[PDB]
């Protein structure tokens, strides 16, 4: 069965650059597909978008609106210490974390620092 390892890297292949709000979003869509044993429908509609024509960004924003799993749901939290364990792309898409923030919204995840602070991956 495809892992999540597996997905990740299928999905990083299409990607531009790296470290980018993409490649987290990646990642959370991973967890959250592996935790719910959603691998396969996940890979399934991002196979699907490509060969519609969708960009890749696209593909992955599509999941969070056609997989069950995402709908309504909350980025997840990922402690870190500083806000350089944040990779560099990633660093002008970070915001201050709304109410009621949710992935299929473009909340990829929630930051939270070691002294408090908490910022929002938004695209």
């Known amino acids: ?6 997905l990740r890297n299928i999905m990083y292949d299409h990607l531009p650059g790296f470290g980018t709000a993409f490649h987290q979003l990646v ?7 592996k935790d719910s044993n ?3 429908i ?16 696209c593909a992955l924003i599509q999941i969070t609106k056609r997989v069950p799993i995402f709908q309504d749901a909350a980025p997840p939290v990922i402690h870190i210490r500083s806000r ?3 990779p560099r792309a990633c660093q002008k898409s970070l915001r ?12 990829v995840c929630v930051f ?12």
Request: proline share 8%.
């Open 1 to 6: 069965d495809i892992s999540a390892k597996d």
């Open 27 to 33: 990642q959370v869509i991973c967890k959250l597909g």
């Open 38 to 40: 959603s691998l396969d």
């Open 42 to 57: 996940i890979h399934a509609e991002f196979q699907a978008s490509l060969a519609e024509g969708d960009s890749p960004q």
């Open 84 to 86: 350089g364990d944040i």
């Open 96 to 107: 201050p974390v709304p109410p009621s923030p949710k992935i299929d919204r473009g909340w």
């Open 112 to 123: 939270q620092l070691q002294d408090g602070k908490t910022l929002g991956l938004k695209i």
